[PDB]
Amino acid sequence: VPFIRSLLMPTTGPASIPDDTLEKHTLRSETSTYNLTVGDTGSGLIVFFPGFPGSIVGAHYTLQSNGNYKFDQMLLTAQNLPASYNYCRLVSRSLTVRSSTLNGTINAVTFQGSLSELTDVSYNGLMSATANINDKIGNVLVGEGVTVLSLPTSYDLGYVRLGDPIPAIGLDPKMVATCDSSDRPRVYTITAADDYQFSSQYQSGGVTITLFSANIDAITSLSIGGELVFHTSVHGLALDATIYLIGFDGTTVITRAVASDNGLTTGIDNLMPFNLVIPTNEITQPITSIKLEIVTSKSGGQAGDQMSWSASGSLAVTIHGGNYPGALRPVTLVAYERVATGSVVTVAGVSNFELIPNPELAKNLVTEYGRFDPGAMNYTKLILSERERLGIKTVWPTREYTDFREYFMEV
Amino acid sequence: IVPFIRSLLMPTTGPASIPDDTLEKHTLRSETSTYNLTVGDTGSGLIVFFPGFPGSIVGAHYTLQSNGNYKFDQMLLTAQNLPASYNYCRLVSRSLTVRSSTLPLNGTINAVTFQGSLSELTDVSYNGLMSATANINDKIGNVLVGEGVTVLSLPTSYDLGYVRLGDPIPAIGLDPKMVATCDSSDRPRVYTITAADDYQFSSQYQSGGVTITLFSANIDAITSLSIGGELVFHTSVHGLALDATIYLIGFDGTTVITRAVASDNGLTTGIDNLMPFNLVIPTNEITQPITSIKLEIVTSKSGGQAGDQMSWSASGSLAVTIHGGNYPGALRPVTLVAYERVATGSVVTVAGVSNFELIPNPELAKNLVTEYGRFDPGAMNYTKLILSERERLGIKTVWPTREYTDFREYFME
Amino acid sequence: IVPFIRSLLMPTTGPASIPDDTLEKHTLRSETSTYNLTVGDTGSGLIVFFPGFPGSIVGAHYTLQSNGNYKFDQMLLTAQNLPASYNYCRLVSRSLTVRSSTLPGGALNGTINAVTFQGSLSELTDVSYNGLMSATANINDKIGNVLVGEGVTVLSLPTSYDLGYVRLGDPIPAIGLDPKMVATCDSSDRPRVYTITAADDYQFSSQYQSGGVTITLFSANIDAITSLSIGGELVFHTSVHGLALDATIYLIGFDGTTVITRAVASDNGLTTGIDNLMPFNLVIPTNEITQPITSIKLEIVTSKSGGQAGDQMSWSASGSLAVTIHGGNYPGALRPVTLVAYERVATGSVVTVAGVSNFELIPNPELAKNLVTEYGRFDPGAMNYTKLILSERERLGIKTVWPTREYTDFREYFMEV
Amino acid sequence: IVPFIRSLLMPTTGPASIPDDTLEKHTLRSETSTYNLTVGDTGSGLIVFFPGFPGSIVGAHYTLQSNGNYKFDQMLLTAQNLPASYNYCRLVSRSLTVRSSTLPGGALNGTINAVTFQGSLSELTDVSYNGLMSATANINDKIGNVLVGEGVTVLSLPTSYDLGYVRLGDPIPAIGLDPKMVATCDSSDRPRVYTITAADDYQFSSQYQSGGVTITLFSANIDAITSLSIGGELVFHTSVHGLALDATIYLIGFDGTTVITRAVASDNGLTTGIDNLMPFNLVIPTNEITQPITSIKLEIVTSKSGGQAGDQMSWSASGSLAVTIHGGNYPGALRPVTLVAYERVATGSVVTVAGVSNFELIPNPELAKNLVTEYGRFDPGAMNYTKLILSERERLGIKTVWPTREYTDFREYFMEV
Ligand SMILES: [Ca+2]
């Protein structure tokens, strides 16, 4: 049964998903190949988005001497799917990670949440991220390697829009226009202040505060809306507010001005709206947190003068298509340590998809409904329900995965 | 035989429930579509059908003008306005035939089913359409207008959810023109446009101001949409003020909607000047399908004199949300029926049937019983089998009517 | 039933792989052809189809003029230009229908005569509406006086299997100073070669004349649709001093028009008592051929600036040329030809052409990145069945040209039996 | 089991006759290929294989330089030069393995990416280590990041059967004054033809300059491994007196180096108001091609010795050329191509290549005196079995490039089932 073969052995090629999502489509296999370099602590982390419906496979981070991670690069597919296709569905995927340059070990786990929801990302802490014995693997020798196999997080998923470019012309050569993954958005609601009282002595240059900081996840476009209302009895106060989207490594990935020299009028509701749209091309690395900064200042102010105001307000962060299964969750982490500095950790995999070509390609790419295979879904359901008894893992010591492949091409 | 298969391939015989896993208590209905369109002076035109549209919008007719541009004629809808009687809907099956019925043999038809939405077509000329798709069973060429063509709607996914119909909601207002509805929303489509990234604008003063069009992009919309985001302007010059307007353009190039985004918005020096977008375009304002969006900015210096240089830098992104836009059938796919060489003044007759699963509005629910629908064990498998053998069976989305008629017979036997 | 037979006899149902021994990884595609041709004032015309052409060239339309000459109208191609997306091709099956679809304001009319000729366009001995009926002796390759309103169906029948894939005349990566520069990789396998001995000690003689004396050394019928080359050499001998030659090659279209002219010699002075060599090296690229070529002629212009009382113009010549039509002998590339002629059709009416071409194709480098290719369904008895059907062609009445009503009946009788 | 299938899937076991319809009396032979290539200082390189080449040319090795350009190392051939003993050939099957076999004194490393492209070398759009992964969409024609120590196996899969025998480029009996004279009978059937319209009334204009003004009229990607010819003609028109042209053709290798330069015009003076003809007749023999050719360019140098105040250099040109790659379109001769790229391999290491090529051959006249030839075992279902296997290629996982460990497992699973 082709689909089962594709599901369990992605490197053999694609097959159509035997569900009820009957769209005329085409099937494709995209490889991923990377030779990553080990930093001086000999330790690092690769974050994989096993169910990502598109070209984003993961991100590599090296562990620094000071204990912080540092972003290296994204891991994508051989070609950029949005450039040739407009819609996509993930069929199957598998990636292997091993050193190619003995030295070191790998710990790996499949977590059912999104990146920022992990409570512990240390080499050893990962082993507890899940309680499923078949979703974690420990101290595998780097030379032997580990294999990440993508297992379903729901079928009958709709096709996802790929963030493809749309026809557009503009004065700015840096103009960008796309149609993004949107169906099934994820929404975070943050009530930053409920009659929060701010008070402080003047200061030339203003007084800065960080109203709040929250963990959120984003890999592609998102928007931030909402409003803060300020009340004050003091005259001459002005506010400056800024939103920061922080990366997994602690760096600032994006900053947006929300208020600039916004003067506060006494005894009135002062409105501070948020109308931000963050496009995919601006997100250089996965975003794991958001924070708001407010700077309070008094132009005609003197030492001694108090600056104060009261605020209430809620924001809504919308990650477009964020709740589409595979888009942000689950996550598979592959951590390595004790690897010789300057070694090469080699990544190699295959992603299989159901796709709908963009207009230009549609002129030459035939699309179809796809082989009818009466018992394929039942067989898949049966296999997955016996997952523990059959030992079907999401993370494998590669040698065992290889044995599993043989034991299968048997039957 | 399986009722659903019968309904799918021969919509004119009536509705049947989709044999998927979307088990909702519903009712089944058939809505006809009948139009007698008039041919313009070039004898050429285009009918754009939304084969999978979950509701009363069937298509739009455009005539080709001597200058080479299309001109909107009218929308093609179902006999009655579904949102007036129902709140939720799902398309079961549909078919329409197009043929000439009058003489004032004359003309031919080219038809194709494109897997994208209207503004995504790269070529909409009578002959260019033949390449919109590579699937031989989704295009048909030079059929005589008198014999006609038949558009058959084929699925673009099952287990689709029910769609809110854009029905009116209970509301009262001081304005007699007030309108309130619950719109198709699940599965929105989102377009993200970065209009400027430190874009430098510079120009010498000029009474009345200077206008530019920052960008123009192709997008699709038939029903309600929203536009949000913000532009941020920086300037070193004093006394400048901006006016900004958003335009939503139709397939025929005409302006369908215009919205002020900025009016006499003064720019302060050495600060981030914020220009937010909070636009909501309701369905009743869209008079024809929207195929593009553009932003206009007018820079002016009130107390300015000849020689004065006006300048500013801008950065910003917008998000256009088409409510329910990505629901399969709502914007894609599209079936185009083009005709040429038809005698001017002739009548091009459209006739069809749309079958739906529906949930009645509160008033109608008092008298309309709803149910889960006939259990039919092998209907889905049979459907899957038929569609997978689509090429071997020759099941088309566009047919020469005579062939579709033969296909019906070969099926009923 | 065998998908291939279905595709062969009913091309509009789509493509299928040829069940022969040419096992190449490929993809299958259907290209449609749609045209609305306008009838000229004599009410008569001719469509020339290349039933087996391995690529986008389907045919050419010509109107018959009051003076009895044909005049080129336009080429008939497929919806898209295959060479833009693919590099190699093989024709699987094809069919086209021709019928009137019109009556202009101010009494329908006309008939069609159609025939499938086993040679190439220029080899036809008679191209008149009635003459066509004798181009072949096969009753199943000709059809007479079919009403234009009913129409005729052209069905492509094989001219050999196990044919190689043909290079498509695709663009190749190139940059040049000239914005009009053109570079392609052309159909070449199986060239067709014409050899013409233009002179074997031919004696030319004449009295001076300002501007020179012109002669057409020869004119010969040849066929070309795409690129060709012409090489060779003429050798001139003379006793007279001061003679200079100009030589030109012309490629003529089916309508008699000059499609191509190429200088082969310009102010070439002849030296006495020596072998004067005139080499030809002409390469005529496909983009320069605007309509099918059906003849070639060579012109020589002799001028005697010099001047010597009593001397006259004279020289002796010998020479042969070779005309190479790239891929010209690939079955289907130039032969066979199916002609569809119409007459008595009301002026201003529309003759509508509609068809499908099915191909095995290998995508170009950019498309290969998103287009999977395969060897194609194994179908054990497909070839034997094909061979059986074709051998019983006469008993079964499988024609290359059909009155459309009959072709339709035939389709029914097939989707049954 | 069918000997042919055995030979096809496991070439190292020896040759077998192709079970097609090309019944020629022949003999069967295996030629080995063995090379120990040295890794340069970037630790990166590329081996280009011609999997289907009907003869001794197996491939070419290139090292990647620090500046990002490739540099030709050497050709990869078979143990003996087939053309020396045979005149005709057909490729039956082939496989080669590439693996590191070394560690130099003072920590192993590296990976291999390999892909089988359906075009010829110059048609590739990206030849970088990672870019290769997208050359084709077929999952069974690409393999990524295989450890160099384990190695990769290239397996030659058919690009059509019923192929003709190919002339081998064998020496022919000849004697000449020049001890460097060379004479061969070359692979010719199925030529590949490129057509380039270099100019169509292109206007050139410029101010005098001692030594002349040089321009590259065009540059185009083409492929050649063995002999080719270039014919054609440029026509120049000018109003200026005293202009003289020099024209040169260059054939460039994959590494950008000039492999061949040929004068096409030397001090060709232009006469005013006349057609000035510049014919090309270049024949580039195989022994002159030192590495695969991937581009061609034409240079024109205009000089105005004359001198006339106000006159400038200028002329108008028209012209087309045809590049004929003898036997170039014979499947396997130029396409397909299998690239094996390596990176991060320790400088100075040895990348070892080992393989076998199996052929149907017709001996030369001297060898024919002691080499019996035959038609070859009749094997009734061998072709059907072959067709069945290839059609189930994806289900069976038959690849053109393999991680060697997997290919070995596949061999076992075959010598069983
Ligand atoms: Ca379902």
CA-to-CA separations, B314 to A278, B301, D35, in angstroms, rounded? 16, 17, 61
Q: Report the candidate in A220, A177, A181 with the shortest Cα–Cα distance to residue A87.
A: A181
Q: Under a CB-based contact definition with an 8 Å cutoff, are residues B220 and B322 in contact?
A: yes
- What SS3 class is residue C92? strand
Q: Which of D134, B124, C36, D323 is nearest to A350 (CA)?
A: D134
Instruction: Give me the amino acid identity at B146.
Output: G
User: Look-up: residue for tokens 């493509």?
Assistant: C15
Going by the DSSP 8-state scheme, the letter that residue B383 receives in this structure is: H
Breaks (C-N over 2.5 A) in chain B follow: 104
Q: Is A141 exposed, middle or buried (0-12, 13-18, 19+ CB in 10 A)?
A: middle
Write the DSSP symbol of residue B130: G
Closest CA to B168 of B368, B362, B323: B362
**Cβ proximity of B29 and B356 under 8 Å:** yes
Element of type H or E holding D390: helix D382-391
Integer-rounded Cα radius of gyration of chain B: 25
Cα separation, D1 vs D3, whole angstroms: 6
The one-letter amino acid code at C411 reads: R
Taking the C-alpha atoms of residue B73 and residue A115, their distance in angstroms, rounded to an integer, is: 52
Give the whole-angstrom CA distance, residue D355 versus residue D155. Answer: 10
- Residue D398 CA to residue D386 CA, distance in Å, equals 12
Instruction: Name the nearest CA neighbour of C367 among D349, A237, D117, D384.
Output: D117
Assess contact for D221 and D88: CB atoms under 8 A: no
Q: How far is CA D184 from CA A206, C216, D282, D325, in A?
A: 89, 40, 16, 15
Q: Are strands A270-278 and A222-231 parallel, antiparallel or unpaired?
A: antiparallel
- The CATH number that domain B1-186+327-413 falls under is 2.60.120.20
Return the half-sphere exposure (C-beta side, CA atoms, 13 A cut-off) of residue C316: 9
Kindly give, in sequence order, each residue whose CB lies less than 8 Å from that of residue B27, ignoring residues fewer than 6 positions away: B357, B358, B359, B360, B368, B369, B370, B371
Cα–Cα distance for residue pair B260/C408, rounded to 1 Å: 61
Cβ partners under 8 Å of residue D324, min gap 6:
C188, D191, D192, D193, D228, D229, D230, D231
- Whether A7 and A92 have beta carbons less than 8 Å apart is answered as yes
Q: Which two tokens stand for residue C288?
A: 């320069």
Query: B194 and A182: CB-CB below 8 Å?
Result: no
Residue limits of CATH 2.60.120.660 in chain D: 190-329
Q: Considering only the top CATH level, what class is A184-323?
A: mainly beta
Chain B residues inside the 8 Å CB shell of C101: 105-108, 142, 144, 341
Show Cβ contacts of residue D309 under 8 Å, excluding neighbours closer than 6 positions: none
| Residues of chain D positioned with their CB less than 8 A from the CB of C383 | none
CB D143 within 8 Å of CB D402: yes
3-state percent helix, strand, coil for chain B, nearest multiple of 5: 15, 45, 40
CA dist B151 to B47, B98, B138, D303, Å?
A: 11, 8, 10, 68
Pairing mode, if any, of strands D86-100 and D111-117? Answer: unpaired
CA A340/CA A335 separation, integer angstroms? 14
Backbone angles phi, psi at B199, to 5 degrees: -80, 130
Q: Give the separation between CA B18 and CA B373, rounded to whole angstroms.
A: 9
Compute the distance between CA of residue D381 and CA of residue A18 in angstroms, rounded to an integer.
36
When computed from its CA atoms, the radius of gyration of chain A, rounded to whole angstroms, is: 25
CB < 8 Å from C in window 314-333 of A: none
Report helix, strand and coil shares of chain C as percent, to nearest 5.
Answer: 15, 45, 40
User: Are the C-beta atoms of residues C223 and C328 closer than 8 Å to each other?
Assistant: yes
**DSSP conformation class of B371:** B
Q: Which amino acid is at A371?
A: R
Among left, alpha and beta (phi > 0; psi -120 to 50; other), residue D397 is left
* Cα dihedral B160, B166, B172, B174 sign: positive
Burial group, residue D268, by CB count within 10 angstroms (0-12, 13-18, 19+): middle
Residue (of D18, D3, D58) closest to D34 by Cα position: D58
> Are C112 and C146 in contact, with CB atoms under 8 Å apart?
yes
B187-326 belongs to CATH 2.60.120.660: yes
CA nearest neighbour of A370 among A353, A383, A386: A353
Contact B267, B299 (CB under 8 A): no
Q: In chain A, which residues fall in CATH 2.60.120.20?
A: 1-183+324-411
Question: How does D70-109 read in b/e, with b if 16+ C-beta sit within 10 Å?
Answer: bbbbebbbbeebbbebbbbbbbbbbbbbbbbebeeeeeeb
Count, residues in chain D: 417
Please say whether the structural domain D1-189+330-417 has been given the CATH code 1.10.600.10.
Answer: no
Cα separation, B379 vs B21, whole angstroms: 12
CB-based contacts of A35, cutoff 8 Å, min separation 6? A100, A344, A345, A346, A347, D111, D145, D343, D344
The span from the CA of C5 to the CA of C187, in Å, is 27
Answer for the pair A187, A314: CB distance below 8 angstroms, yes or no: no
Order the strands of the C70-77 sheet from edge to edge: C70-77, C57-64, C45-49, C337-343, C111-117, C142-147
Which amino acid is residue C173, in one-letter code? P
For residues D202 and C177, what is the distance between their CA atoms, to the nearest angstrom? 8
Contact indicator for A333, A45 with CB cutoff of 8 Å: yes
Which of C66-96 are b and which e, b meaning 16 or more Cβ less than 10 Å from the residue's Cβ?
A: eeeebbbbebbbbbbbbbebbbbbbbbbbbb
Fold of D190-329: Jelly Rolls (2.60.120)
CA nearest to B59, candidates B44, B69, B73, B43: B73
Q: Which two tokens stand for residue A196?
A: 């929060």
Distances in Å between the Cα of C23 and the Cα atoms of B34, C86, C191, D121 are 52, 18, 23, 22
Identify the three-state secondary structure at position C387.
helix
Sign (positive or negative) of CA dihedral A319, A320, A325, A329 = negative
Q: Do C162 and C21 form a contact (C-beta atoms < 8 A)?
A: yes
Tell how far the Cα of B378 is from the centroid of ligand 1, in angstroms.
Answer: 14
Query: Cis before residue A325, ω within 30 degrees of 0?
Result: no
The CATH code of domain A1-183+324-411 reads 2.60.120.20
End-to-end CA distance of chain C: 10
Backbone angles phi, psi at D6, to 5 degrees: -60, -50
Q: Is residue A28 within 8 angstroms of chain C, CB to CB? A: yes
For strands D192-206 and D243-253, give the pairing. unpaired
The runs of H, that is alpha helices, within B231-361 are none
Task: Say if residue D51 is preceded by a cis peptide, omega within 30 of 0.
Answer: no
Which tokens hold the place of C335?
A: 């032969």
What values do phi and psi take at B235, rounded to 5?
-155, 155
Q: What are phi and psi of C20, to 5 degrees?
A: -105, -155
Q: CA-CA distance, D395 to D392, in Å (whole number)?
A: 5
Q: Quick one: closest CA in B to A174, which residue?
A: B197
DSSP string, D186-239: ---SS-EEEEEEEEEEEEEEE---TT-EEEEEEEEEEEESS-EEEEEEEEEE-S
Two tokens at C81? Answer: 């230009």
Residue with token string 């256009």: B320
* Residues forming CATH 2.60.120.660 domain(s) in chain B: 187-326
Q: In whole angstroms, what is the distance from residue C248 CA to residue C270 CA?
A: 17
d(CA C84, CA C364): 8
- Token readout for A197 is 């009282």
Please give the C-alpha separations between residue B42 and each of B64, B70, B140, D379, in angstroms, as whole numbers: 7, 11, 22, 67
Q: Which of B105, B130, B142 sits opposite C103 (nearest CB)?
A: B105
First CA to last CA distance, chain D: 10
Amino acid letter for position B159: D
CA distance A277 to A237: 28
CB–CB contact A22 B194 (8 Å) = no
Residue with tokens 């321009």: D215
Nearest residue of A to residue B384 by CA position? A372
First CA to last CA distance, chain B: 11
C98 CB neighbour count, 10 Å cutoff:
26
Cα–Cα dist D293/D120, whole Å: 11
DSSP C102: B
Contact B49, B334 (CB under 8 A): yes
Chain D residue with Cα closest to C226: D195
- Is C306:C269 a contact under the CB 8 Å cutoff? no
**If 0-12 CB within 10 Å is exposed, 13-18 middle and 19+ buried, where does residue B265 land?**
middle
Partnered with residue C36 across adjacent β-strands are C352
Q: Using DSSP, state whether C223 is helix, strand or coil.
A: strand
Distance from CA of D139 to the nearest CA of C (A): 9
**Per-residue exposure over A293-321, b if at least 16 CB sit within 10 Å of its own CB, e if not:** bbebbbeebeeeeebebebbbebebbbbb
User: Which amino acid, B342?
Assistant: V
DSSP D332-376: TSS--EEEEEEESPPTT-EEEEEEEEEEEEEE-HHHHTT---B--
Q: What is the 3-state secondary structure (H, E, C) of chain A?
A: CHHHHHHHCHHHCCCCCCCCCCCCEEEEEEEEEEEEECCCCCCEEEEECCCCCCCEEEEEEEECCCCCEEEEEEEECCCCHHHCEEEEEEEEEEEEEEECCCCCEEEEEEECCCHHHCCCCCCCHHHHCCCCHHHEEEEEECCCCEEEECCCCCCCCCCEECCEECCEEECCCCCEEEEECCCCCEEEEEEEEEEEEEEEECCCCCEEEEEEEEEEEECCCEEEEEEEEEECCCCCEEEEEEEEEEECCCCEEEEEEEEEEEECCCCCCEEEEEEEEECHHHCCCCEEEEEEEEEEEECCCCCCCEEEEEEEEEEEEEECCCCCCCCCCCEEEEEEECCCCCCEEEEEEEEEEEEEECHHHHCCCCCECCCCCCCHHHHHHHHHHCHHHHCCCCEEEHHHHHHHHHHHHHC
Across the A:D interface, residue pairs with CB atoms under 8 Å apart total 54
Which token pair is D150? 């384990």
| Diameter over CA atoms, chain D | 88
Resolution as reported, in Å: 2.6
Q: Residue D206 in contact with residue C206, Cβ under 8 Å?
A: no
Q: How far is A3 from chain D (nearest CA, A)?
A: 11
C254 to B179, C60, C295: CA distances (angstroms): 69, 10, 8
How many residues does this entry show for chain A? 411
Q: Do A79 and C367 count as a contact with CB atoms less than 8 A apart?
A: no
Cα–Cα distance between A202 and A235 in angstroms, integer? 12
Q: Which residues of C touch A83 (CB under 8 A)?
A: none
Check CB contact under 8 Å for B108 and C100. Answer: no
C-beta of residue C150 within 8 angstroms of C-beta of residue C403: yes
Task: Convert D161-175 to b/e letters by CB count within 10 Å (16 or more is b).
Answer: bbbebbbbbbeeeee
Distance CA D248, CA D256 (A): 17
| Secondary structure element (H or E) that encloses residue B356, with its range | strand B347-360
**Which chains pack against A, by 3+ Cβ pairs within 8 A?**
B, C, D
Instruction: State the distance from the centre of ligand 1 to the C-alpha of A182, rounded, in angstroms.
Output: 21
Q: How far from chain centre, in Å, is Cα B368?
A: 30
- DSSP string of B210-235, one letter each residue: EEEEEEEEEEEESS-EEEEEEEEEE-
Compute, in degrees rounded to 10, the torsion defined by CA atoms B12, B18, B24, B29. Answer: 0
CB interface of C with D, residues 1-20, below 8 Å: 20
Q: Of the candidates A83, A222, A223, which has an alpha carbon nearest to the alpha carbon of residue A162?
A: A83
Q: Is D279 helix (H, G, I), strand (E, B) or coil?
A: strand
- What whole-number distance in Å separates Cα of residue A42 and Cα of residue D177? 70
**Interface check C32 vs B, CB under 8 A:** yes
Neighbours of C (≥3 Cβ pairs closer than 8 A)? Answer: A, B, D
Spatial separation of the C-alpha atoms in residues B270 and B28, rounded to whole Å: 63
Shortest distance between the Cα of C359 and any Cα of chain A, in A, equals 13
